[PDB]
Design a protein around this motif. Structure first.
Motif, short mmCIF file in Angstrom:
data_model
loop_
_atom_site.label_atom_id
_atom_site.label_comp_id
_atom_site.label_asym_id
_atom_site.label_seq_id
_atom_site.Cartn_x
_atom_site.Cartn_y
_atom_site.Cartn_z
N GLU A 285 6.98 -7.57 -5.64
CA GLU A 285 7.85 -7.70 -4.45
C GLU A 285 6.95 -7.74 -3.21
O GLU A 285 5.86 -7.14 -3.25
CB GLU A 285 8.83 -6.53 -4.34
CG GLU A 285 9.83 -6.49 -5.47
CD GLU A 285 10.97 -5.52 -5.23
OE1 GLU A 285 10.96 -4.83 -4.19
OE2 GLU A 285 11.89 -5.47 -6.08
N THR A 286 7.43 -8.36 -2.14
CA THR A 286 6.63 -8.52 -0.90
C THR A 286 7.21 -7.71 0.27
O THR A 286 8.44 -7.76 0.50
CB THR A 286 6.57 -10.00 -0.48
OG1 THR A 286 5.99 -10.73 -1.56
CG2 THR A 286 5.78 -10.23 0.78
N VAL A 287 6.34 -6.98 0.96
CA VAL A 287 6.71 -6.29 2.23
C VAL A 287 5.73 -6.79 3.29
O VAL A 287 4.50 -6.60 3.09
CB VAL A 287 6.67 -4.76 2.13
CG1 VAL A 287 6.82 -4.11 3.50
CG2 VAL A 287 7.72 -4.24 1.17
N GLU A 288 6.24 -7.42 4.34
CA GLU A 288 5.40 -7.86 5.47
C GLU A 288 5.74 -6.95 6.64
O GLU A 288 6.94 -6.86 6.99
CB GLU A 288 5.61 -9.34 5.80
CG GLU A 288 5.29 -10.26 4.63
CD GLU A 288 5.24 -11.74 4.97
OE1 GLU A 288 4.38 -12.14 5.77
OE2 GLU A 288 6.10 -12.48 4.46
N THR A 289 4.74 -6.27 7.20
CA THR A 289 5.02 -5.30 8.29
C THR A 289 3.73 -4.93 9.03
O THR A 289 2.65 -5.04 8.44
CB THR A 289 5.63 -4.01 7.71
OG1 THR A 289 6.00 -3.12 8.77
CG2 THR A 289 4.70 -3.27 6.76
N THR A 290 3.88 -4.52 10.28
CA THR A 290 2.77 -3.84 10.98
C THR A 290 2.75 -2.41 10.44
O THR A 290 3.78 -1.95 9.88
CB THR A 290 2.96 -3.82 12.49
OG1 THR A 290 4.17 -3.11 12.78
CG2 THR A 290 3.01 -5.21 13.08
#
Ligand SMILES: OC[C@H]1O[C@H](O)[C@H](O)[C@@H](O)[C@@H]1O
Ligand code: NA
Ligand code: NA
Length: 149
Positions: free
Chosen positions: A43-48
């Protein structure tokens, strides 16, 4: 006991889940090599984050799915890191939020100097609730063990 309901790892185990669980491949524990974790679905999480420069892409395994794979019976999990960090995490966090055990950062495996090989990651920039020290403290890096209570 060893239920033997999860296959034994073929490579070096990098995560051991133990404690108040049902499904195991060792005495009271579920040992996972990196291949077994990737096979559960990435699964992908894109975040600062407080520790990275700009928005970064993490790819990893759903911690809710890992709790279902081992048949977690408890409501709390203690993450134990290579660096000795101990962090208690309510398992309900894994469901409410897309929490992942990250394996890759910007498409590359994470070395120990890059807070790897495994890092608990919440989607911080998806909800103001997650932009808080409560969830940064639960974001254990260099995870080696998850002890379910
Ligand atoms: O980097 C973690 C968090 O830092 C700050 O709180 C930002 O305002 C927020 O958007 C971000 O998710
Ligand atoms: Na046991
Ligand atoms: Na805490």
């Amino acid at each position: 006991s060893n239920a033997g309901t999860i296959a034994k790892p073929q490579g070096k185990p990098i995560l051991t889940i133990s404690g108040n669980i049902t499904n195991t491949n060792a005495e009271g524990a579920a040992q996972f090599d990196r291949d077994m974790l990737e096979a559960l679905g990435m699964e992908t999480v894109e975040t600062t984050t407080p520790w990275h420069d700009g928005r970064v892409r993490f790819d990893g395994v759903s911690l809710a799915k890992l709790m279902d794979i081992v048949g977690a019976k408890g409501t709390s999990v203690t993450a134990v890191a290579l660096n000795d960090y101990v962090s208690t995490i309510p398992i309900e966090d894994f469901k409410k939020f897309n929490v992942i055990l990250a394996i890759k950062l910007d498409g590359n495996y994470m070395t120990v100097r890059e807070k790897g090989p495994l890092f608990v990651i919440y989607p911080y920039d998806s909800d103001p609730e997650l932009q808080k020290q409560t969830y940064y403290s639960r974001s254990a890096w260099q995870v080696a063990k998850l002890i379910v209570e």
